[PDB]
C-alpha positions as a Python dict, from the first residue, in 0.01 Angstrom:
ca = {
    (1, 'X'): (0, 0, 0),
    (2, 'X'): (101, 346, -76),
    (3, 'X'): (8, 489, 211),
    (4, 'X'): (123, 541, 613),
    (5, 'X'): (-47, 502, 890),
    (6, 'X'): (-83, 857, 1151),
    (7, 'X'): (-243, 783, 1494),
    (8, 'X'): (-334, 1109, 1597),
    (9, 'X'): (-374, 1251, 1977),
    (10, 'X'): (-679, 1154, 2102),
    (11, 'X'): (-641, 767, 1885),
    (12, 'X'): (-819, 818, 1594),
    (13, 'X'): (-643, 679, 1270),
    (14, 'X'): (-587, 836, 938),
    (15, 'X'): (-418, 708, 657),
    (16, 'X'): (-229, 944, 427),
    (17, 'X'): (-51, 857, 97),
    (18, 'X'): (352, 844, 118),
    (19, 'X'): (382, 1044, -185),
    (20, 'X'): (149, 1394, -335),
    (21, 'X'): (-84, 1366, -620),
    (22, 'X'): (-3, 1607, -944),
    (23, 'X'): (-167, 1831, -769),
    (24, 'X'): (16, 1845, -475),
    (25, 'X'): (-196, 1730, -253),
    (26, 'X'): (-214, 1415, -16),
    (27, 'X'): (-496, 1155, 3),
    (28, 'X'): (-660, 1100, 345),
    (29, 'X'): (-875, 779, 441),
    (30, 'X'): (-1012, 742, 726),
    (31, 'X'): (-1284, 531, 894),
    (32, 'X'): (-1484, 602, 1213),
    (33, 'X'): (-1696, 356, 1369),
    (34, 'X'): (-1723, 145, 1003),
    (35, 'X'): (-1809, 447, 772),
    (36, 'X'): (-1544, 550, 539),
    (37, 'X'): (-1472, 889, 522),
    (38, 'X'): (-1202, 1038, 257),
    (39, 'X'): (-1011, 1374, 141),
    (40, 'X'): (-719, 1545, 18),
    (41, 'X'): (-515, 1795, 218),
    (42, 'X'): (-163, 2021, 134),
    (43, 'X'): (-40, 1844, 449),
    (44, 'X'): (129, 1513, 448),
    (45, 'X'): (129, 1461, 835),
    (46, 'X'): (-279, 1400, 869),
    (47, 'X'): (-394, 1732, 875),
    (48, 'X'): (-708, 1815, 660),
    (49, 'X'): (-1064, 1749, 608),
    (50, 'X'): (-1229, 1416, 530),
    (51, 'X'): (-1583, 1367, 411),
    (52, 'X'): (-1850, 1049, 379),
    (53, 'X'): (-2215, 976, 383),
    (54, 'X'): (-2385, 793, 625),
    (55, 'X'): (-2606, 488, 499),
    (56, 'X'): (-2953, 747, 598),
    (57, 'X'): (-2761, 1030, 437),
    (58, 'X'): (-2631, 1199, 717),
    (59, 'X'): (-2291, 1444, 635),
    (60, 'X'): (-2037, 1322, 800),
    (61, 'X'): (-1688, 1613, 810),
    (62, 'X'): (-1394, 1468, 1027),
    (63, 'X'): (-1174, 1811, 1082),
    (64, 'X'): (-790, 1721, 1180),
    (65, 'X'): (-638, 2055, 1257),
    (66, 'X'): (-261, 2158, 1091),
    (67, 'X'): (-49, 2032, 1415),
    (68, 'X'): (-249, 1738, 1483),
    (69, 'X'): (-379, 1879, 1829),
    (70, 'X'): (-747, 1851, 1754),
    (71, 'X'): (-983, 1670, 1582),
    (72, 'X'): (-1358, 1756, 1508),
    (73, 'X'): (-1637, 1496, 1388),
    (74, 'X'): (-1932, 1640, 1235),
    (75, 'X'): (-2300, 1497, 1155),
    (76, 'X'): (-2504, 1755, 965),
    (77, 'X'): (-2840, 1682, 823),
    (78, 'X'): (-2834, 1552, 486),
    (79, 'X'): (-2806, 1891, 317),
    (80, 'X'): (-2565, 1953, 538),
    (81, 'X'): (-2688, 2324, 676),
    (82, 'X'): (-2736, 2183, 962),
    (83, 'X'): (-2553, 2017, 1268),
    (84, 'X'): (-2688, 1722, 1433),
    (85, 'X'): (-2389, 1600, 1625),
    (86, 'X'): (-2026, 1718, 1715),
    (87, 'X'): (-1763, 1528, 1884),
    (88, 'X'): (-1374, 1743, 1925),
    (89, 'X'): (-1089, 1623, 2124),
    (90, 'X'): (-827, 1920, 2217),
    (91, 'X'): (-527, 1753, 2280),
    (92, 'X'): (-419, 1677, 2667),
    (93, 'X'): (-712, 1891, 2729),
    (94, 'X'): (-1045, 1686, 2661),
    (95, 'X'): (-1308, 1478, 2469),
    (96, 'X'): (-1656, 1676, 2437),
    (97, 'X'): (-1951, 1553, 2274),
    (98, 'X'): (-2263, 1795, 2129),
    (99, 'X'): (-2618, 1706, 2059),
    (100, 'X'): (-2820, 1941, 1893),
    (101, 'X'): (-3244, 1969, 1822),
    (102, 'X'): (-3399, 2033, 1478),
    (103, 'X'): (-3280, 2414, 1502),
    (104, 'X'): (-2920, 2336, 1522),
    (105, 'X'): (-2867, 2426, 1895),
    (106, 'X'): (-2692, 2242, 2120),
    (107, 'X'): (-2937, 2020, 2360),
    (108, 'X'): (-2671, 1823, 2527),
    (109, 'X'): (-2272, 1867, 2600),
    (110, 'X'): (-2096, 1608, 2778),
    (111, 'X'): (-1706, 1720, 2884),
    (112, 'X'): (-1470, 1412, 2961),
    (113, 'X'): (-1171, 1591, 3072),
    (114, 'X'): (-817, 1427, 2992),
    (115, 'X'): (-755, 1347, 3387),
    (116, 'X'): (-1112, 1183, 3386),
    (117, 'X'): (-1362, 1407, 3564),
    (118, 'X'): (-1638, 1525, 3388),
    (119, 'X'): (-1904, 1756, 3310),
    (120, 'X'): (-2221, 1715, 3186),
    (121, 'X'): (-2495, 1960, 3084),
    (122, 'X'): (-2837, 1868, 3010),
    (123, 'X'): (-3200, 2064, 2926),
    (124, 'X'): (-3020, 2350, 2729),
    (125, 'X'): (-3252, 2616, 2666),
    (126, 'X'): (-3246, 2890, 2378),
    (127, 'X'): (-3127, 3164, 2687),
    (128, 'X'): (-2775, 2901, 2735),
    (129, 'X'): (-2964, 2784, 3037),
    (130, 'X'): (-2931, 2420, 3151),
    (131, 'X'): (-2836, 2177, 3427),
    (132, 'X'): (-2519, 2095, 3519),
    (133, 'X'): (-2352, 1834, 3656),
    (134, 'X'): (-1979, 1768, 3775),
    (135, 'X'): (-1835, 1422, 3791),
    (136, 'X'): (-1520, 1367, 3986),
    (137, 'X'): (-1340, 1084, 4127),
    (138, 'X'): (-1562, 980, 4428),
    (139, 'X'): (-1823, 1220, 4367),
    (140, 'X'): (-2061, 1404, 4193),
    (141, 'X'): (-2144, 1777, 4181),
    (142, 'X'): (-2503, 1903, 4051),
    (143, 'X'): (-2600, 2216, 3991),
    (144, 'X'): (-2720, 2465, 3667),
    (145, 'X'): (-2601, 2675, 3366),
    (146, 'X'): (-2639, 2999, 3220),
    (147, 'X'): (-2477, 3179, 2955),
    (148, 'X'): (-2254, 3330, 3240),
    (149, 'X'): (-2094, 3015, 3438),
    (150, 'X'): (-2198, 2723, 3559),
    (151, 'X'): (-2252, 2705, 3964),
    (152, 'X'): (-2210, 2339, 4149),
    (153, 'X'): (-2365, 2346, 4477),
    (154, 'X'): (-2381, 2144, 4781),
    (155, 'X'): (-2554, 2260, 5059),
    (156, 'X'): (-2486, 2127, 5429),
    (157, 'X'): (-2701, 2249, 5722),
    (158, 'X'): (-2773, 2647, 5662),
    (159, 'X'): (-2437, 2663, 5436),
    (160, 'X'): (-2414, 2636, 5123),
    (161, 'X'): (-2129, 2598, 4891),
    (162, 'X'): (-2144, 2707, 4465),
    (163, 'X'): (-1831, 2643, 4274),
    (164, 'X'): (-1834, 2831, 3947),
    (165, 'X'): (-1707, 2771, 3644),
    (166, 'X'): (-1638, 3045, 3414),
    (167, 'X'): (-1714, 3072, 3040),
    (168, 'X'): (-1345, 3017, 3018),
    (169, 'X'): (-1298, 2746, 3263),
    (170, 'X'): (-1198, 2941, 3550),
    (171, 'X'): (-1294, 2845, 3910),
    (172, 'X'): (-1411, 3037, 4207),
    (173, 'X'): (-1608, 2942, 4474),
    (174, 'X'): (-1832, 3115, 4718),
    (175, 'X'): (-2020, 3020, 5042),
    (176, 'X'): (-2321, 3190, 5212),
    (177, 'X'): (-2435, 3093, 5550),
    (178, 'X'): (-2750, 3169, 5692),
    (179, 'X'): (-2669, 3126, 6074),
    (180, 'X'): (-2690, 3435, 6188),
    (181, 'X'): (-2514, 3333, 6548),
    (182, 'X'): (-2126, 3467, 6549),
    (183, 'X'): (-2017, 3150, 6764),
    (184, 'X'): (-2153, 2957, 6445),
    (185, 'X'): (-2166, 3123, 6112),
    (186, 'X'): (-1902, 3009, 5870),
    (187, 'X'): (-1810, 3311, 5644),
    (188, 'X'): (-1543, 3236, 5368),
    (189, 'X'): (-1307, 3447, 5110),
    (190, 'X'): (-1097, 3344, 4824),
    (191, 'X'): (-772, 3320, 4664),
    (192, 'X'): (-812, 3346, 4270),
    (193, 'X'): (-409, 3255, 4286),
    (194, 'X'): (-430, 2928, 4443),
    (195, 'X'): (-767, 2843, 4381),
    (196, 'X'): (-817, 2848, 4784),
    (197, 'X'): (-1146, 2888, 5014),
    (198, 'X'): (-1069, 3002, 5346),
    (199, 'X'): (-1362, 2967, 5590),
    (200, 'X'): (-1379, 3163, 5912),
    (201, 'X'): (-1617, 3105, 6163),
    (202, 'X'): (-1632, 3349, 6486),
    (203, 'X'): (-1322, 3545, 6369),
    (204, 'X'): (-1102, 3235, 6320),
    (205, 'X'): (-970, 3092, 5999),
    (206, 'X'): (-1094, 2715, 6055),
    (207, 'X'): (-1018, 2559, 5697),
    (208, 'X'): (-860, 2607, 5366),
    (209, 'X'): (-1036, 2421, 5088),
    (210, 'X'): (-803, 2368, 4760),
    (211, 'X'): (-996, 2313, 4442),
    (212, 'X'): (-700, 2203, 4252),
    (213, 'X'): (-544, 2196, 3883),
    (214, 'X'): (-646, 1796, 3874),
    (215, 'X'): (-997, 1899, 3993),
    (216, 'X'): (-984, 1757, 4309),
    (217, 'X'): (-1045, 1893, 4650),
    (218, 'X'): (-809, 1899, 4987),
    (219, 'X'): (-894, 2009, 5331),
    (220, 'X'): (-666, 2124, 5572),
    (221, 'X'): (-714, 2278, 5916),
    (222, 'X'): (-573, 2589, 6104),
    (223, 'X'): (-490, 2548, 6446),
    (224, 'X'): (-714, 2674, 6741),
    (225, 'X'): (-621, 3017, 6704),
    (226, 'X'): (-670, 3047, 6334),
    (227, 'X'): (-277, 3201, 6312),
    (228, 'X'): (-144, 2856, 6159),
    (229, 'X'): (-217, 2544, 5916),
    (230, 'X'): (-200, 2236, 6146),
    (231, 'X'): (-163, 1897, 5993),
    (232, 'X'): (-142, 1832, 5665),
    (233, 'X'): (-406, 1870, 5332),
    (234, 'X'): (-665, 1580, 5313),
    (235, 'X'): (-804, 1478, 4946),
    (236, 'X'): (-1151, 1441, 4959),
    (237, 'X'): (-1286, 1134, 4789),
    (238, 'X'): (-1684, 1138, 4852),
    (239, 'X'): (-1955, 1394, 4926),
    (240, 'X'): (-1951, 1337, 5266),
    (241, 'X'): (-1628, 1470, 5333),
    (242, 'X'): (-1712, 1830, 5166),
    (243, 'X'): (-2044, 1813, 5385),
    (244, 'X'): (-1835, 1739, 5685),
    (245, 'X'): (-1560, 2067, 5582),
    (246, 'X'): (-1892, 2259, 5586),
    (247, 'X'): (-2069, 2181, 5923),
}
């Protein structure tokens, strides 16, 4: 065969001829989930664009970008104005998947991030509103979306706790108490920096919560007179343990 295999980041395969056509170009073949899709790029490395048609006449446009580091499968109606489905992995960043209604608007997006958490958002309105739900190792997060961020929350007595997400991935995290007693009320700031919740609770710095870069959570206490970390950071692994940081 005249051609070389590439297995791209993110493990899909694409064949590419060794040599150009008088043209120039390079042929691509590729085949995802037993349709085979085919192209022609100026690239010789498994960059370009491959097309097929699904046996109900679906579109079907796999997208490799120039350096490799993404890769975008398309499903468009069979007049192809209009997207059905939309798969993209961003290289040692994450796999999403997109399901979209008659209208072409996304309905469904589930996130499966490269270290294996996950987000999911389901119900998506016209307004970007949905529901939202976090999956990490041990536990799950539920909350909603808006066009704004999403918000995670998990509420423990009269406190509760959001996490939000930023349109542009960035955490910060917030916690409102309604105790109103000073001997009880946990109050909380945070450090955009390191990611960190401090929670105070009659003047004292009780805990630091780290929502860290491999979207996990540690807990760590300050000693009695809230001057000093004591111990060292915990990893949370279940729901009970973020409860139990916000009693």
């Amino acid at each position: 065969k005249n051609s070389v295999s590439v297995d791209l980041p993110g493990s899909m395969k694409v064949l590419v001829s060794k040599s150009s056509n008088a043209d120039g170009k390079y042929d691509l073949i590729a085949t995802v989930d037993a349709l085979e899709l085919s192209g022609t790029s100026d690239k010789n490395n498994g960059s370009g664009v491959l097309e097929g048609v699904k046996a109900d006449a679906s579109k079907v446009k796999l997208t490799i970008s120039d350096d490799l580091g993404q890769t975008t499968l398309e499903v468009f109606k069979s007049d192809g104005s209009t997207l059905v489905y939309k798969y993209v992995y961003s290289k040692d960043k994450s796999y999403t998947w997109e399901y979209f209604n008659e209208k072409g608007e996304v309905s469904y997006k589930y996130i499966y991030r490269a270290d294996g958490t996950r987000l999911e958002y389901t119900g998506i309105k016209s307004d970007g509103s949905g529901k939202a739900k976090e999956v990490l190792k041990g536990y799950v997060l539920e909350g909603t979306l808006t066009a704004e961020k999403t918000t995670l929350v998990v509420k423990e007595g009269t406190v509760t706790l959001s996490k939000n997400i930023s349109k542009s991935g960035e955490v910060s995290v917030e916690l409102n108490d309604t105790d109103s007693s000073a001997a009880t009320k946990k109050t909380a700031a945070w450090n955009s920096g390191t990611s960190t919740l401090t929670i105070t609770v009659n003047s004292k710095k009780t805990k630091d919560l780290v929502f860290t870069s491999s979207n996990t959570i540690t807990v760590q206490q300050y000693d009695s007179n809230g001057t000093s970390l004591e111990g060292s950071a915990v990893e949370i692994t279940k729901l009970d343990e973020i409860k139990n940081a916000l009693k």
